[PDB]
Amino acid sequence: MEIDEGKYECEACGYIYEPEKGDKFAGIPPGTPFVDLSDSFMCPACRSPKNQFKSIKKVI
Ligand SMILES: [Zn+2]
């Protein structure tokens, strides 16, 4: 792992929301940052609350 952007991963099921692709699994156009999701957005993989999504802005 090594990058920083609007990439979010589900700490619950490990899903991964891509802003450059949009929340297709849910219903959002590409180029949309996870910051544009509503507080009611649910993971399209495990249906968890958007509050369970975390970004990946770290590089080792
Ligand atoms: Zn999930």
Side-chain angles (χ1 to χ4, degrees):
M1 60 243 304
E2 49 131 310
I3 160 179
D4 316 291
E5 214 57 85
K7 270 149 226 257
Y8 276 61
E9 177 246 341
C10 202
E11 238 193 29
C13 88
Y15 180 90
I16 285 289
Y17 167 80
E18 270 269 15
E20 192 220 297
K21 276 219 160 98
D23 230 312
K24 232 218 146 269
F25 226 133
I28 286 102
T32 289
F34 166 89
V35 306
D36 249 53
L37 296 194
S38 17
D39 217 82
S40 252
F41 168 85
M42 317 175 185
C43 189
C46 80
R47 222 82 121 207
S48 277
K50 183 185 141 249
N51 306 123
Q52 237 301 144
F53 274 84
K54 258 271 259 282
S55 39
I56 57 139
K57 53 164 109 234
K58 288 284 283 156
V59 296
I60 290 179

mmCIF file of all heavy atoms in Angstrom, residues 2-7 56-59:
data_model
loop_
_atom_site.group_PDB
_atom_site.id
_atom_site.type_symbol
_atom_site.label_atom_id
_atom_site.label_comp_id
_atom_site.label_asym_id
_atom_site.label_seq_id
_atom_site.Cartn_x
_atom_site.Cartn_y
_atom_site.Cartn_z
ATOM 1 N N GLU A 2 0.475 2.270 -0.717
ATOM 2 C CA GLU A 2 1.285 3.521 -0.758
ATOM 3 C C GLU A 2 0.616 4.554 -1.667
ATOM 4 O O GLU A 2 0.874 4.612 -2.852
ATOM 5 C CB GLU A 2 2.638 3.096 -1.333
ATOM 6 C CG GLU A 2 2.416 2.268 -2.600
ATOM 7 C CD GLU A 2 3.314 2.798 -3.719
ATOM 8 O OE1 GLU A 2 3.305 3.996 -3.942
ATOM 9 O OE2 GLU A 2 3.995 1.993 -4.336
ATOM 10 N N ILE A 3 -0.241 5.372 -1.120
ATOM 11 C CA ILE A 3 -0.926 6.403 -1.955
ATOM 12 C C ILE A 3 -1.835 7.271 -1.085
ATOM 13 O O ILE A 3 -2.047 6.999 0.080
ATOM 14 C CB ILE A 3 -1.748 5.612 -2.982
ATOM 15 C CG1 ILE A 3 -2.848 6.501 -3.566
ATOM 16 C CG2 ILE A 3 -2.385 4.391 -2.312
ATOM 17 C CD1 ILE A 3 -3.644 5.711 -4.607
ATOM 18 N N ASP A 4 -2.371 8.315 -1.647
ATOM 19 C CA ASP A 4 -3.268 9.210 -0.859
ATOM 20 C C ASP A 4 -4.315 9.849 -1.775
ATOM 21 O O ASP A 4 -3.997 10.399 -2.811
ATOM 22 C CB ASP A 4 -2.348 10.278 -0.268
ATOM 23 C CG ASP A 4 -1.086 9.616 0.290
ATOM 24 O OD1 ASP A 4 -1.196 8.923 1.288
ATOM 25 O OD2 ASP A 4 -0.031 9.812 -0.291
ATOM 26 N N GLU A 5 -5.564 9.783 -1.400
ATOM 27 C CA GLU A 5 -6.632 10.387 -2.246
ATOM 28 C C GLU A 5 -8.001 10.172 -1.595
ATOM 29 O O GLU A 5 -8.144 10.244 -0.391
ATOM 30 C CB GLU A 5 -6.549 9.645 -3.580
ATOM 31 C CG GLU A 5 -6.908 10.602 -4.719
ATOM 32 C CD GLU A 5 -5.980 11.819 -4.673
ATOM 33 O OE1 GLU A 5 -4.896 11.732 -5.224
ATOM 34 O OE2 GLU A 5 -6.372 12.815 -4.088
ATOM 35 N N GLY A 6 -9.009 9.905 -2.380
ATOM 36 C CA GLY A 6 -10.363 9.683 -1.800
ATOM 37 C C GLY A 6 -10.657 8.183 -1.751
ATOM 38 O O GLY A 6 -11.796 7.763 -1.790
ATOM 39 N N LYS A 7 -9.638 7.372 -1.657
ATOM 40 C CA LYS A 7 -9.864 5.900 -1.597
ATOM 41 C C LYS A 7 -10.263 5.499 -0.176
ATOM 42 O O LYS A 7 -9.545 5.742 0.772
ATOM 43 C CB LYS A 7 -8.520 5.275 -1.976
ATOM 44 C CG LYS A 7 -8.463 5.071 -3.491
ATOM 45 C CD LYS A 7 -7.015 5.191 -3.967
ATOM 46 C CE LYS A 7 -6.958 6.079 -5.211
ATOM 47 N NZ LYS A 7 -6.794 5.132 -6.350
ATOM 48 N N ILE A 56 -7.579 5.893 2.775
ATOM 49 C CA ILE A 56 -6.223 5.272 2.796
ATOM 50 C C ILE A 56 -5.170 6.292 2.354
ATOM 51 O O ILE A 56 -4.631 6.212 1.268
ATOM 52 C CB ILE A 56 -6.301 4.115 1.800
ATOM 53 C CG1 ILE A 56 -6.715 4.650 0.428
ATOM 54 C CG2 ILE A 56 -7.336 3.097 2.283
ATOM 55 C CD1 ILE A 56 -5.902 3.946 -0.661
ATOM 56 N N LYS A 57 -4.873 7.251 3.187
ATOM 57 C CA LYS A 57 -3.857 8.276 2.814
ATOM 58 C C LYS A 57 -2.560 8.045 3.594
ATOM 59 O O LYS A 57 -2.166 8.849 4.415
ATOM 60 C CB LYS A 57 -4.485 9.616 3.201
ATOM 61 C CG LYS A 57 -4.928 9.567 4.665
ATOM 62 C CD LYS A 57 -5.175 10.990 5.170
ATOM 63 C CE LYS A 57 -6.678 11.208 5.363
ATOM 64 N NZ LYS A 57 -6.991 12.429 4.569
ATOM 65 N N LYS A 58 -1.896 6.950 3.343
ATOM 66 C CA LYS A 58 -0.625 6.665 4.069
ATOM 67 C C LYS A 58 0.382 5.991 3.133
ATOM 68 O O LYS A 58 0.013 5.321 2.189
ATOM 69 C CB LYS A 58 -1.020 5.720 5.203
ATOM 70 C CG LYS A 58 -1.797 6.496 6.269
ATOM 71 C CD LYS A 58 -0.826 7.339 7.096
ATOM 72 C CE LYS A 58 -0.089 6.440 8.091
ATOM 73 N NZ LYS A 58 1.183 7.159 8.385
ATOM 74 N N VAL A 59 1.650 6.161 3.389
ATOM 75 C CA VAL A 59 2.679 5.530 2.514
ATOM 76 C C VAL A 59 3.884 5.086 3.350
ATOM 77 O O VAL A 59 4.480 5.871 4.061
ATOM 78 C CB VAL A 59 3.087 6.623 1.526
ATOM 79 C CG1 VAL A 59 1.886 6.993 0.651
ATOM 80 C CG2 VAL A 59 3.555 7.858 2.298
#
